[PDB]
Amino acid sequence: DLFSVRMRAQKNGKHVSGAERIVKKEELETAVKELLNRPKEFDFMNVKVEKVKDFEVVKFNLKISTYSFKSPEEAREFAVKKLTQEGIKEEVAKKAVEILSKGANPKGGNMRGAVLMDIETGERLEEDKERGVRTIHFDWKDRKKVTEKLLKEGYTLRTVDALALTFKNLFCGVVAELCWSDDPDYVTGYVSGKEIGYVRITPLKEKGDPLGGRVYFVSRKELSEIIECLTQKVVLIEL
Numbered sequence: 150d151l152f153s154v155r156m157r158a159q160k161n162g163k164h165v166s167g168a169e170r171i172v173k174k175e176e177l178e179t180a181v182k183e184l185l186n187r188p189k190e191f192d193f194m195n196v197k198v199e200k201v202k203d204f205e206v207v208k209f210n211l212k213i214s215t216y217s218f219k220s221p222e223e224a225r226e227f228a229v230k231k232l233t234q235e236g237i238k239e240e241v242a243k244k245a246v247e248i249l250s251k252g253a254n255p256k257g258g259n260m261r262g263a264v265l266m267d268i269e270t271g272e273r274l275e276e277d278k279e280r281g282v283r284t285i286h287f288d289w290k291d292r293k294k295v296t297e298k299l300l301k302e303g304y305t306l307r308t309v310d311a312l313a314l315t316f317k318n319l320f321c322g323v324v325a326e327l328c329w330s331d332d333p334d335y336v337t338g339y340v341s342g343k344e345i346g347y348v349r350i351t352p353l354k355e356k357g358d359p360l361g362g363r364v365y366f367v368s369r370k371e372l373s374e375i376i377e378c379l380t381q382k383v384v385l386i387e388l
């Protein structure tokens with residue numbers, strides 16, 4: 150018996166925190182305490198506890214690597230390069246980078262979710278270009294174990310969280326992903342795919358840029374199944 154525990158929190162109408170845990174009932178309360186304690190300041194928080202019907206367990210298997218650069222132009226140049234090692238045409242990879250740096254939300258600011266980009270044509274397939282699509286209903290099978298292991302190998306808690314999210318994306322049929330943070334202080338981003346692994350890349354923006362986002366590279370012929378998988382299928386990831 151599994152329960153999905155989803156938390157989001159706002160402050161001054163702005164989203165400041167959000168997380169999901171999928172656990173056995175005997176750790177339900179523990180998961181709720183953790184997420185309730187997650188944001189520092191908030192004026193509104195919602196928590197959803199949902200009994201899980203079906204779910205799938207999947208074995209994590211991406212290679213991790215790390216790269217440092219001396220300007221965002223050089224980090225984005227490398228980012229485009231790694232993307233074309235997943236068979237993506239260079240101009241498609243470049244338009245992704247172009248969209249994130251110039252503001253992915255057409256009415257200014259960050260999106261509430263990821264761009265779905267046609268691998269072949271670079272065109273944005275998400276219907277709501279302010280909202281995008283959100284990957285949800287994923288968690289590490291044994292998050293306590295995974296967090297301690299990755300911390301001691303030198304990865305941060307943001308790495309722990311982003312890894313589980315990409316791996317679901319790739320399992321759901323996203324070919325490749327580009328991501329850097331919306332938070333102007335954090336400036337590591339990544340690029341991922343089944344062949345290039347999980348590729349951490351610093352810095353993909355200047356420390357002070359408030360723009361970020363994610364671009365998912367998807368084959369249009371699979372768009373409907375991909376969206377269903379990202380947003381509805383329940384996946385536990387086993388390290």
Ligand SMILES: CC(C)(COP(=O)(O)OP(=O)(O)OC[C@H]1O[C@H](n2cnc3c(N)ncnc32)[C@@H](O)[C@H]1OP(=O)(O)O)[C@@H](O)C(=O)NCCC(=O)NCCS
Binds near residue numbers: 280285
């Ligand atoms: C937050 C999360 C748990 C979704 O929870 P949810 O309660 O089911 O959210 P809902 O779909 O019901 O959203 C309803 C409202 O809360 C929104 N909201 C939810 N998640 C949001 C997010 N990640 N960013 C901005 N707004 C968000 C509000 O925008 C509004 O959604 P709307 O755009 O559809 O109008 C999801 O983002 C998640 O799985 N996060 C874990 C991974 C992660 O964020 N890692 C960060 C480091 S990579």
Ligand SMILES: Nc1ncnc2c1ncn2[C@@H]1O[C@H](COP(=O)(O)O)[C@@H](O)[C@H]1O
Binds near residue numbers: 261263284285330331
């Ligand atoms: N669950 C999600 N699925 C897809 N995209 C997201 C999700 N959460 C955030 N994003 C996008 O990725 C950017 C970075 O988010 P974060 O990982 O929370 O810093 C955000 O500005 C959103 O545009």
